[PDB]
């Protein structure tokens, strides 16, 4: 299925920095014994600040990503938070319209705005890991749980079903040499919450990490972000959220209970929750505030809509794919989701 596999940093820069080369190494080496040939796309190891200060050259390697015809799947390095600033480079013009086709597309967490970029252009994407965050495992081997869905992923082309893992893990606190052949620490997984609603409910699936679409519509952390989504129309229309399911992420900021609640409730104000099917929530990393957000969303989350918390997708280890765009059969009693690529 995957021969060729293009590396793209689209949000942070860090993979081309001397500090985590030894990361990086590990991560190409690992591609390479699961039957790839990883390249690097042009100015993906360029560095933080390169990457930063040049958001068209991000743009320019996702545009050569999709118009390679030899690049079989493309993998995005890590998030950051910043990639909307591609918009102009990628829409003004059609630019990336030009060459978009169907190629697989993984990545997460400011990725996020780049899988609103791609669902607008009719593509169907794969949210959940990333190059550095889960190819790139320190230990002796990928996450088992982590590695399931990825070797999937290259083989077929597809992923069919997710269930929840055994175990979680904490996320490391040294990631230096030094860590290489060590275990995070691991944790007893307790499995899909059904917080209300309906155990089984289906749609098509969209979303991704709750600081990324809240920087849609707030504009504290980049002052021209609701500008720019509004300009190029990045949130779908709420006829296109309309029976879908909606996940929901969050990320190593670990934001507080009362800024988690102004998030939904800001999402709220859109208009999302009068039309999904039901909403997917990920367990938040570390469990930080695990207890807290249960709550949040039992506070806020309109009544009718059926809730799936502690899924293994987002910010917390090992880490589910789930593919966006492809009908979804959520059962919460059994514990799987089920996906039909014909409907
Ligand atoms: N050097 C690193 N190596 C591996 N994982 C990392 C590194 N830096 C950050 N992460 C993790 O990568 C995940 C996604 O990061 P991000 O895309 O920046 O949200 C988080 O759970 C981070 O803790």
Redesign the pocket.
């Known amino acids: 299925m995957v021969s060729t596999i293009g590396i793209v940093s689209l ?2 820069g ?1 993979i081309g920095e001397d500090f ?1 080369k030894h ?1 990086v190494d590990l991560g190409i080496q690992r591609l390479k014994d699961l039957g790839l040939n990883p390249i690097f796309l042009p100015h993906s190891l360029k560095g933080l600040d390169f990457i930063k200060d040049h958001p068209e050259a991000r743009a320019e390697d996702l545009i050569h990503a999709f118009s390679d015809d030899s690049i079989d799947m493309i993998l995005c390095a ?3 938070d910043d990639t909307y600033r591609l918009l102009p480079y990628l829409f003004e013009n059609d630019q990336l319209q030009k060459v978009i086709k169907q190629k697989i597309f993984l990545g ?3 990725t996020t705005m780049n899988h609103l970029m791609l669902h607008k252009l009719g593509i169907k994407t794969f949210y959940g890991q ?1 190059f ?2 889960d190819i ?1 495992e320190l230990d002796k081997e990928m996450l088992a749980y982590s590695l399931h869905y990825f070797k999937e992923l290259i083989e077929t082309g597809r992923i069919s079903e997710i269930r929840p893992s055994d175990v979680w893990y904490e ?1 490391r606190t040294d ?1 230096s040499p030094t860590a290489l052949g060590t275990p995070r620490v691991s944790h007893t997984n307790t499995g899909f919450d059904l917080l209300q609603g309906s155990a089984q409910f289906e749609g098509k699936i969209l979303g991704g990490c709750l600081e990324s679409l809240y920087d849609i519509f707030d504009n504290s952390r980049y002052a021209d972000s609701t500008e720019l989504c509004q300009k190029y129309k990045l949130f779908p229309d709420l006829s296109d959220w309309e029976g879908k399911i909606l996940l929901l992420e969050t ?2 900021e670990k934001p507080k209970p009362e800024d988690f609640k102004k998030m939904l409730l800001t999402l709220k104000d859109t208009g999302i929750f009068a039309v999904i099917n039901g909403l997917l929530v990920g367990k938040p ?1 570390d469990e930080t505030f695990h207890d807290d957000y249960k709550e949040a969303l039992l506070d806020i989350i309109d009544s009718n809509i059926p809730i799936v918390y502690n899924l293994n997708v987002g ?1 917390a280890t090992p880490r589910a794919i789930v593919p966006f765009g492809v009908h979804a059969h959520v059962d919460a009693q059994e514990q799987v989701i089920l996906f039909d690529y014909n409907k």
Request: aromatic share 10%; hydrophobic share 40%.
């Open positions: 949000s942070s860090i985590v990361e890590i998030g950051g997460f967490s400011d990333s550095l965050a790139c996320e990631f990320s190593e990393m910010h």
